[PDB]
mmCIF file of C-alpha atoms and ligand atoms in Angstrom:
data_model
loop_
_atom_site.group_PDB
_atom_site.id
_atom_site.type_symbol
_atom_site.label_atom_id
_atom_site.label_comp_id
_atom_site.label_asym_id
_atom_site.label_seq_id
_atom_site.Cartn_x
_atom_site.Cartn_y
_atom_site.Cartn_z
ATOM 1 C CA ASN A 927 0.000 0.000 0.000
ATOM 2 C CA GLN A 928 2.851 2.416 0.818
ATOM 3 C CA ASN A 929 4.782 1.528 -2.353
ATOM 4 C CA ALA A 930 1.730 1.813 -4.643
ATOM 5 C CA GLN A 931 0.650 5.002 -2.859
ATOM 6 C CA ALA A 932 4.109 6.558 -3.302
ATOM 7 C CA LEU A 933 3.997 5.514 -6.977
ATOM 8 C CA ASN A 934 0.548 7.117 -7.319
ATOM 9 C CA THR A 935 1.887 10.286 -5.667
ATOM 10 C CA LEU A 936 4.842 10.287 -8.097
ATOM 11 C CA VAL A 937 2.410 9.950 -11.014
ATOM 12 C CA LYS A 938 0.091 12.644 -9.603
ATOM 13 C CA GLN A 939 2.929 15.158 -9.183
ATOM 14 C CA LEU A 940 3.348 15.216 -12.984
ATOM 15 C CA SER A 941 0.115 17.231 -13.277
ATOM 16 C CA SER A 942 1.403 19.910 -10.885
ATOM 17 C CA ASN A 943 2.227 23.311 -12.350
ATOM 18 C CA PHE A 944 5.001 24.545 -9.963
ATOM 19 C CA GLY A 945 4.340 28.079 -11.252
ATOM 20 C CA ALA A 946 4.036 27.181 -14.940
ATOM 21 C CA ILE A 947 1.382 28.268 -17.417
ATOM 22 C CA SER A 948 0.535 24.583 -18.029
ATOM 23 C CA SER A 949 1.774 21.312 -16.556
ATOM 24 C CA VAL A 950 2.177 19.226 -19.738
ATOM 25 C CA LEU A 951 5.482 19.655 -21.587
ATOM 26 C CA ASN A 952 4.255 19.425 -25.187
ATOM 27 C CA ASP A 953 1.757 22.294 -24.980
ATOM 28 C CA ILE A 954 4.215 24.764 -23.422
ATOM 29 C CA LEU A 955 6.770 23.632 -25.985
ATOM 30 C CA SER A 956 4.454 23.825 -28.983
ATOM 31 C CA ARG A 957 3.207 27.429 -28.592
ATOM 32 C CA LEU A 958 6.380 29.108 -27.268
ATOM 33 C CA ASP A 959 9.752 29.945 -28.763
ATOM 34 C CA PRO A 960 12.743 28.147 -27.100
ATOM 35 C CA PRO A 961 14.732 31.220 -25.813
ATOM 36 C CA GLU A 962 11.646 32.409 -23.917
ATOM 37 C CA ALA A 963 10.465 28.864 -23.163
ATOM 38 C CA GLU A 964 13.669 27.594 -21.496
ATOM 39 C CA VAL A 965 12.850 28.977 -18.022
ATOM 40 C CA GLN A 966 9.225 27.847 -18.582
ATOM 41 C CA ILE A 967 10.547 24.308 -19.060
ATOM 42 C CA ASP A 968 13.094 24.715 -16.240
ATOM 43 C CA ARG A 969 10.511 25.391 -13.502
ATOM 44 C CA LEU A 970 8.872 22.039 -14.337
ATOM 45 C CA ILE A 971 12.376 20.499 -14.518
ATOM 46 C CA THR A 972 13.321 21.527 -10.971
ATOM 47 C CA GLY A 973 9.861 20.696 -9.574
ATOM 48 C CA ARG A 974 9.772 17.189 -11.059
ATOM 49 C CA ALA B 1 -42.433 26.858 1.007
ATOM 50 C CA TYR B 2 -39.195 25.067 1.905
ATOM 51 C CA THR B 3 -38.044 21.501 1.323
ATOM 52 C CA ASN B 4 -34.740 19.625 1.219
ATOM 53 C CA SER B 5 -32.786 18.264 -1.729
ATOM 54 C CA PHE B 6 -31.382 14.826 -1.024
ATOM 55 C CA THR B 7 -28.492 14.144 -3.450
ATOM 56 C CA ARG B 8 -29.461 16.259 -6.461
ATOM 57 C CA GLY B 9 -27.659 19.114 -8.169
ATOM 58 C CA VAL B 10 -24.558 17.213 -9.332
ATOM 59 C CA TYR B 11 -23.152 17.420 -12.862
ATOM 60 C CA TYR B 12 -19.930 17.075 -14.850
ATOM 61 C CA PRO B 13 -17.105 19.502 -13.852
ATOM 62 C CA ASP B 14 -14.717 19.685 -16.808
ATOM 63 C CA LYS B 15 -16.471 18.098 -19.893
ATOM 64 C CA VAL B 16 -13.997 15.199 -19.673
ATOM 65 C CA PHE B 17 -14.237 11.399 -19.555
ATOM 66 C CA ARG B 18 -13.032 9.458 -16.517
ATOM 67 C CA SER B 19 -13.582 5.800 -15.682
ATOM 68 C CA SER B 20 -13.182 3.692 -12.500
ATOM 69 C CA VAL B 21 -11.489 6.542 -10.611
ATOM 70 C CA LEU B 22 -12.406 8.965 -7.833
ATOM 71 C CA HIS B 23 -11.879 12.620 -8.769
ATOM 72 C CA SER B 24 -11.958 15.612 -6.422
ATOM 73 C CA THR B 25 -12.833 19.003 -7.901
ATOM 74 C CA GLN B 26 -13.660 22.554 -6.813
ATOM 75 C CA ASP B 27 -16.662 23.939 -8.701
ATOM 76 C CA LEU B 28 -20.065 25.587 -8.021
ATOM 77 C CA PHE B 29 -22.343 22.825 -6.709
ATOM 78 C CA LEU B 30 -25.646 22.458 -4.894
ATOM 79 C CA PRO B 31 -24.894 21.362 -1.295
ATOM 80 C CA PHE B 32 -26.419 18.144 -0.013
ATOM 81 C CA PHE B 33 -29.338 18.400 2.470
ATOM 82 C CA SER B 34 -29.752 22.156 1.999
ATOM 83 C CA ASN B 35 -33.008 24.100 2.029
ATOM 84 C CA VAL B 36 -34.309 24.344 -1.541
ATOM 85 C CA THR B 37 -37.328 26.478 -2.375
ATOM 86 C CA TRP B 38 -40.556 24.769 -3.481
ATOM 87 C CA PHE B 39 -43.142 26.639 -5.564
ATOM 88 C CA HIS B 40 -46.465 25.278 -6.790
ATOM 89 C CA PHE C 829 3.263 4.449 -16.878
ATOM 90 C CA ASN C 830 5.618 7.122 -18.243
ATOM 91 C CA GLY C 831 9.131 6.151 -17.182
ATOM 92 C CA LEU C 832 8.134 3.863 -14.289
ATOM 93 C CA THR C 833 8.887 0.152 -14.612
ATOM 94 C CA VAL C 834 8.560 -2.676 -12.096
ATOM 95 C CA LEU C 835 11.257 -5.316 -12.203
ATOM 96 C CA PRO C 836 10.144 -8.852 -11.283
ATOM 97 C CA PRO C 837 11.895 -10.638 -8.403
ATOM 98 C CA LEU C 838 14.709 -13.065 -9.139
ATOM 99 C CA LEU C 839 13.127 -15.798 -7.001
ATOM 100 C CA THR C 840 9.640 -16.680 -8.182
ATOM 101 C CA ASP C 841 6.883 -17.800 -5.838
ATOM 102 C CA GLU C 842 7.335 -21.456 -6.838
ATOM 103 C CA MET C 843 11.036 -21.244 -5.933
ATOM 104 C CA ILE C 844 10.281 -19.509 -2.617
ATOM 105 C CA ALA C 845 7.697 -22.240 -1.948
ATOM 106 C CA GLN C 846 10.301 -24.874 -2.846
ATOM 107 C CA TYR C 847 12.772 -23.281 -0.394
ATOM 108 C CA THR C 848 10.089 -23.404 2.311
ATOM 109 C CA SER C 849 9.206 -26.989 1.325
ATOM 110 C CA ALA C 850 12.886 -27.983 1.540
ATOM 111 C CA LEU C 851 13.138 -26.279 4.953
ATOM 112 C CA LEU C 852 9.954 -27.996 6.172
ATOM 113 C CA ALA C 853 10.988 -31.451 4.928
ATOM 114 C CA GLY C 854 14.416 -30.865 6.469
ATOM 115 C CA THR C 855 13.066 -29.852 9.873
ATOM 116 C CA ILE C 856 10.447 -32.649 9.925
ATOM 117 C CA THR C 857 12.856 -35.408 8.889
ATOM 118 C CA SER C 858 15.926 -34.188 10.812
ATOM 119 C CA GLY C 859 15.122 -31.679 13.584
ATOM 120 C CA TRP C 860 17.946 -29.183 13.872
ATOM 121 C CA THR C 861 20.857 -31.075 12.352
ATOM 122 C CA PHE C 862 20.368 -30.034 8.705
ATOM 123 C CA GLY C 863 21.143 -26.437 9.669
ATOM 124 C CA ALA C 864 24.342 -27.563 11.383
ATOM 125 C CA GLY C 865 25.835 -30.209 9.104
ATOM 126 C CA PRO C 866 24.320 -33.065 7.114
ATOM 127 C CA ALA C 867 20.643 -33.884 7.524
ATOM 128 C CA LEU C 868 20.587 -36.801 9.963
ATOM 129 C CA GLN C 869 17.310 -38.703 10.180
ATOM 130 C CA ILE C 870 15.491 -39.203 13.483
ATOM 131 C CA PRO C 871 11.944 -40.305 14.391
ATOM 132 C CA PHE C 872 9.718 -37.312 15.066
ATOM 133 C CA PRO C 873 8.772 -38.509 18.613
ATOM 134 C CA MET C 874 12.489 -38.588 19.496
ATOM 135 C CA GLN C 875 12.959 -35.188 17.828
ATOM 136 C CA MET C 876 10.085 -33.805 19.922
ATOM 137 C CA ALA C 877 11.632 -35.613 22.916
ATOM 138 C CA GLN D 537 -16.611 14.716 -24.224
ATOM 139 C CA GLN D 538 -13.678 14.998 -26.622
ATOM 140 C CA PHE D 539 -10.692 13.414 -24.808
ATOM 141 C CA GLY D 540 -10.271 11.309 -21.680
ATOM 142 C CA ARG D 541 -7.615 12.155 -19.107
ATOM 143 C CA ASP D 542 -5.547 10.024 -16.756
ATOM 144 C CA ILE D 543 -4.755 10.792 -13.109
ATOM 145 C CA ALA D 544 -1.779 12.724 -14.465
ATOM 146 C CA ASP D 545 -2.149 15.451 -17.077
ATOM 147 C CA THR D 546 -1.816 13.076 -20.045
ATOM 148 C CA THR D 547 -4.462 11.899 -22.486
ATOM 149 C CA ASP D 548 -5.944 8.384 -22.451
ATOM 150 C CA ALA D 549 -8.522 8.510 -25.261
ATOM 151 C CA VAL D 550 -9.618 11.049 -27.880
ATOM 152 C CA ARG D 551 -12.600 11.679 -30.144
ATOM 153 C CA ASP D 552 -11.257 11.690 -33.698
ATOM 154 C CA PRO D 553 -12.208 14.718 -35.809
ATOM 155 C CA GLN D 554 -13.623 14.354 -39.381
ATOM 156 C CA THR D 555 -15.237 10.978 -38.486
ATOM 157 C CA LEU D 556 -16.528 11.482 -34.874
ATOM 158 C CA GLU D 557 -14.879 8.210 -33.820
ATOM 159 C CA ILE D 558 -13.505 7.257 -30.401
ATOM 160 C CA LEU D 559 -9.924 5.934 -30.193
ATOM 161 C CA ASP D 560 -7.977 4.593 -27.212
ATOM 162 C CA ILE D 561 -4.476 5.944 -26.559
ATOM 163 C CA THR D 562 -1.964 3.706 -24.806
ATOM 164 C CA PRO D 563 1.788 4.477 -24.887
ATOM 165 C CA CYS D 564 4.051 2.191 -26.886
ATOM 166 C CA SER D 565 6.403 -0.084 -24.989
ATOM 167 C CA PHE D 566 9.645 0.920 -23.285
ATOM 168 C CA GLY D 567 12.128 -0.430 -20.789
ATOM 169 C CA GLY D 568 15.662 -0.346 -19.544
ATOM 170 C CA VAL D 569 18.535 -1.972 -21.403
ATOM 171 C CA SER D 570 20.362 -4.534 -19.267
ATOM 172 C CA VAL D 571 23.489 -6.214 -20.634
ATOM 173 C CA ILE D 572 24.653 -9.618 -19.386
ATOM 174 C CA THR D 573 28.394 -10.190 -19.787
ATOM 175 C CA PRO D 574 30.769 -12.845 -18.418
ATOM 176 C CA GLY D 575 33.444 -10.162 -18.013
ATOM 177 C CA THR D 576 36.305 -9.250 -20.331
ATOM 178 C CA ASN D 577 38.615 -11.788 -18.625
ATOM 179 C CA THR D 578 36.748 -14.657 -20.342
ATOM 180 C CA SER D 579 34.933 -13.519 -23.502
ATOM 181 C CA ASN D 580 33.665 -10.391 -25.245
ATOM 182 C CA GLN D 581 30.264 -11.909 -26.100
ATOM 183 C CA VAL D 582 27.308 -10.132 -24.483
ATOM 184 C CA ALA D 583 23.595 -10.783 -24.098
ATOM 185 C CA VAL D 584 21.134 -7.887 -24.104
ATOM 186 C CA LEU D 585 18.020 -7.893 -21.918
HETATM 187 C C1 NAG E 1 43.336 -8.373 -15.260
HETATM 188 C C2 NAG E 1 43.594 -9.745 -15.805
HETATM 189 O O1 NAG E 1 44.343 -9.921 -16.773
HETATM 190 N N1 NAG E 1 42.957 -10.748 -15.164
HETATM 191 C C3 NAG E 1 42.997 -12.184 -15.446
HETATM 192 C C4 NAG E 1 44.398 -12.779 -15.219
HETATM 193 O O2 NAG E 1 44.811 -12.529 -13.881
HETATM 194 C C5 NAG E 1 44.409 -14.279 -15.498
HETATM 195 O O3 NAG E 1 45.737 -14.782 -15.409
HETATM 196 C C6 NAG E 1 43.852 -14.571 -16.894
HETATM 197 C C7 NAG E 1 43.728 -16.047 -17.186
HETATM 198 O O4 NAG E 1 42.372 -16.425 -17.383
HETATM 199 O O5 NAG E 1 42.533 -14.010 -17.024
HETATM 200 C C8 NAG E 1 42.451 -12.564 -16.842
#
């Protein structure tokens, strides 16, 4: 129960924003340029 | 005239499909066992 | 999942059951002696004695 | 509905446009690459798991 619950918490922290405009990587990649989108990626990088 | 709603006033929060899960949301809902107004 | 994998154990449940069956047959047919040296047979009333 | 969501923020199903058809989305398979070797002291043959 603890191992599956920690795995479910690790899955459920992927949908967290951590200050981003969206939590999924492909949407914030696909409508932003890279030199403005690098810090937008990097907040999700350090949170995950 | 006043009466009580039992479990009514629920709907779909985010126009999305979910199956065999339990989802918690924050949205405008009718509270359970509240005083609803009855008119004839 | 996305990046999460679960490795199976090296010992399967049949092999863990065969270890416990070997331990149970060893303790029933020899008492305590199979954990010390060779498994030396003894009647189970004299083992319990 | 148009698309189903998982407990994370990833899709699980989608309504197809131009046909109004429902399709299931599962990710294609992945896994780690484990290499079994006897060591370079014996042979350079390897087996890939
Ligand atoms: C580092 C190294 O060369 N290790 C061994 C060596 O000690 C041994 O003599 C030889 C014979 O199999 O195999 C190899």
